[PDB]
Design an enzyme around this catalytic site. Structure first.
Site, PDB file in Angstrom:
ATOM      1  N   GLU A 140       1.007  -1.191   0.019  1.00  0.00           N
ATOM      2  CA  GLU A 140      -0.084  -0.130   0.026  1.00  0.00           C
ATOM      3  C   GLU A 140       0.769   1.192  -0.112  1.00  0.00           C
ATOM      4  O   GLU A 140       1.550   1.634   0.917  1.00  0.00           O
ATOM      5  CB  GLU A 140      -1.134  -0.068   1.187  1.00  0.00           C
ATOM      6  CG  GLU A 140      -2.066   0.886   1.270  1.00  0.00           C
ATOM      7  CD  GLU A 140      -2.472   1.734   2.694  1.00  0.00           C
ATOM      8  OE1 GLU A 140      -2.443   0.960   3.541  1.00  0.00           O
ATOM      9  OE2 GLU A 140      -2.797   2.790   2.615  1.00  0.00           O
ATOM     10  N   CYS A 146      -1.821   8.831   2.809  1.00  0.00           N
ATOM     11  CA  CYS A 146      -2.288   8.261   1.545  1.00  0.00           C
ATOM     12  C   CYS A 146      -3.415   8.377   0.789  1.00  0.00           C
ATOM     13  O   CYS A 146      -3.769   8.397  -0.178  1.00  0.00           O
ATOM     14  CB  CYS A 146      -1.686   6.900   1.726  1.00  0.00           C
ATOM     15  SG  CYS A 146      -0.113   6.412   2.177  1.00  0.00           S
TER      16      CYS A 146
END
Lengths: 461, 453
Positions: free
Chosen positions: A235, A269
């Site tokens: 990720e 993110c």
């Protein structure tokens, strides 16, 4: 006294004051070897425990997180600069994901049967062995628990390499899990630098790895893991778009957009990074957003009233400084902010960039700081085109109450997750992860616990 | 490099010019264009085109079988079976693919929260020569039903199989550019994986190629699936139907002329039946018919290339010099083509390299063990872990084997087979990820979380 590379790589440096609070020694290769021997050995025993024992221990971890949320929160806030209130919330989520897998994990890992000519044929699910987790500073508890709850419920053991600037957080998680009753060696924190991750993946006892962070480290790890025939989940960064259309409740879009850009001082993110506004609604949105950003309180993250702490490190401050100066020089217009603040600690003010020229570097870049890019568009096609015109593809958020535009955004936004009239959150009940350069694989939900098991097919005559 | 060399006669039957970097690029351009449209087709269109491909396979099994036999040396009967299975996997994803990709809803405070499954885009598949139809349809059927396009890099010695697969799919009605075959060398794969249009990749084969592919994919932040070699144990304990074990173990070692990733390669025998079983195994191998693979009587044809024969010659020469014993075979036959005989090795010294190697030829290693602990210890004493077979009618022994063997697959009183209805893949140095069953078609899709206020 003599500064050595060994003692200088890992430290608590408070980003609010710049002061070095405490330093740590990195493990030697030998010391690393021995932690892995210890893990391998705890694995042989740990895989024999029952879901009951694992559920019990996980429940215990959740209760420790809840009891001492403020203590843990202060550790977070001291080491990497997030507001105390949001850090309390991150401790509470960490407990939540622990409970999610205590409750669902046995059922998620039950035998699935398939009728064949066999007397018995099914897939069953078994722990891989030692897993390596490379984790980031920005959600220093949450990212670790969302990985560790499912991995331990599945019967694996794990060695954690944290970001070198949150060693107290990392030690805290090791200690939490020990205190919850998980046997020594099941979860161990490695105080090691990024260059030492190579030794860990190449070790034959280490079966799989996961990394949440940025491309450089993720490319490095997945490259090496690949070369060793070991599976990874990644990720990485995003440049999530936040797309606002004429039928949207703009006030709520503005409020949630601001939060989604500024939470964690912009260092998420899944932040709204690129606001893409329909030309009808644009003037009104841009101005309302300007005014909200302008109202944010910048200050000491220990203070309840503070909306915006410092960025987490100096490096992080120069990144965003350069990225912004660069865009301004190429012709971009600053509506607000756009300069580090004249003060102690790593502060960068909420910032908004408009009228960015085609070709500017920053269009393809991840702004890990509270700095919004704003774009106007004529129609849904242009909005998709711009939303997807990035190397990344983690999250995306679109605001509209026209059912057709809703399905179009759902279908055509190239992201791992699409939220309609809401900010993208990660919720343990649902999988979560990236496409494109934001990575691959899925954490949370069912997928989170299937990710690092041997799905063993069984056929009994 | 890229050629048909008949392994029965050792002779070159035709050559092929590899693509240039410019020709590769244009194929990728064309795959991208086809993807933009192919992805808008309905499951019903894809199901029909898939069904057509199964009908083209079932109809011409014989002809396709000859292309496989001619290029890589398997017996014509087993090529026929490979073509039939290739068809089966196609009908499987045509039947189940839509349901397998349906939205899955999960209650939350969202009005609607769910996961849907969308195609990623262009997929690179790197396939091997040993099952040159099956390995491609196994990968292509799920991938196309999900709405991806694919480019295939097949092994350099099976270019005709590689072209036939492309042709089958255009003939079934998949639009030009949905599945393209690339006549390119191993070193050119890099170009392809590095191209930003290529989203993910898959590779069935050996470790040198898989390591390289998965290394480069990693550097580019792209997921892969690897199915590599194995050294599957075939473990025989005292309550086993010995005769069945011998007949089936022989098939499992010997099918595809021993060139199977899930062949039984290390036979692990309890001391209380070792002598009986070993003698019978010895007798079975000794009388298999070695010959022209087009001829129906043939059990054993040749190995697929000069290199394959050299590797196994070397490996057995090397083990014999180390102290291993030849019960049977252990030398290339003196006759045209790449023939290596059914061979059995026993009394292998501890520390011998071969214990850790994949034997891609009909060569069995045999071991004697005292108990279950020791059998499992040896079963797992390898870098691989694809499959494992264990023979026994004590249900407790059965469960120990099922639990403790480190393999992607465990079969009890049967040989390991890949069935489309169930998942299949490796652990350890055999790879990761799963094809077939539900996993097969979920592998190369965006699992997208959707949240509606």
């Amino acid at each position: 006294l003599v500064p050595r590379g060994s003692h200088m790589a890992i430290a608590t440096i408070n980003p609010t004051t710049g002061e070095i609070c405490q330093r740590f020694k990195a493990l030697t290769p030998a010391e690393i070897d021995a932690k892995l021997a210890k893990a391998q050995e705890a694995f042989q025993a740990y895989r024999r425990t029952s879901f009951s024992q694992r559920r019990q221990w996980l429940e215990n971890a959740a209760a420790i997180l809840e009891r001492d949320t403020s203590k843990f929160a202060e550790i977070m806030t001291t080491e990497m600069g997030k507001t105390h209130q949001s850090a309390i919330a991150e401790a509470e989520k960490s407990a939540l994901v622990c409970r999610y897998y205590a409750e669902h994990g046995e059922q998620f890992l039950a035998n699935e049967y398939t009728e064949t000519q066999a007397t018995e044929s099914y897939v069953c699910y078994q722990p891989l062995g030692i897993l390596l987790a490379v984790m980031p500073w920005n959600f220093p508890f949450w990212q670790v628990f969302r990985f560790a709850a499912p991995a331990l419920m599945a019967g694996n053991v794990a060695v954690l390499k944290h970001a070198s600037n949150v060693p107290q957080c990392a030690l805290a998680v090791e200690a939490i899990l020990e205190a919850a009753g998980f046997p020594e060696g099941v979860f161990q924190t490695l105080l090691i630098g990024a260059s030492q991750v190579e030794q860990v993946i190449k070790d034959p006892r280490v079966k799989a790895a996961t990394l949440t962070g940025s491309e450089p480290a993720g490319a490095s790890l997945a490259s090496l893991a690949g070369q060793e025939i070991k599976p990874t989940l990644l990720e990485l960064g995003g440049s999530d778009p936040f797309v606002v259309f004429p039928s949207a409740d703009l006030d709520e879009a503005v409020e949630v957009g601001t939060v989604a850009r500024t939470m964690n001082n912009g260092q998420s993110c899944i932040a709204a990074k690129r606001f893409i506004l329909h030309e009808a609604i644009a003037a009104e949105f841009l101005e309302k957003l300007h005014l909200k950003f302008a109202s944010l309180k910048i200050g000491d993250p220990m203070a309840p009233e503070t909306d915006i702490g410092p960025l987490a490190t100096e490096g992080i401050l120069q990144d965003i400084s350069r990225q912004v100066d660069q865009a301004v020089a190429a012709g971009a217009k600053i509506l607000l902010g756009g300069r580090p603040l004249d003060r102690a600690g790593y502060f960068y003010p909420p910032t908004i960039l408009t009228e960015i020229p085609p070709g500017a570097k920053i269009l393809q870049e991840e702004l890990f700081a509270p700095v919004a890019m704003v774009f106007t568009v004529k129609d849904l096609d242009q909005a998709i085109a711009l939303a997807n015109d990035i190397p990344f593809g983690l999250g995306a958020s679109a605001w509209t109450n026209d059912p057709a535009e809703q399905q179009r955004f759902i279908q055509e936004l190239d992201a791992g997750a699409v939220f309609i009239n809401g900010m993208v959150k990660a919720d343990p009940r649902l999988p979560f992860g990236g496409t494109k350069r934001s990575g691959y694989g899925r954490e949370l939900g069912l997928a989170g616990i299937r990710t690092f098991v041997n799905a063993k097919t069984v056929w009994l005559k």
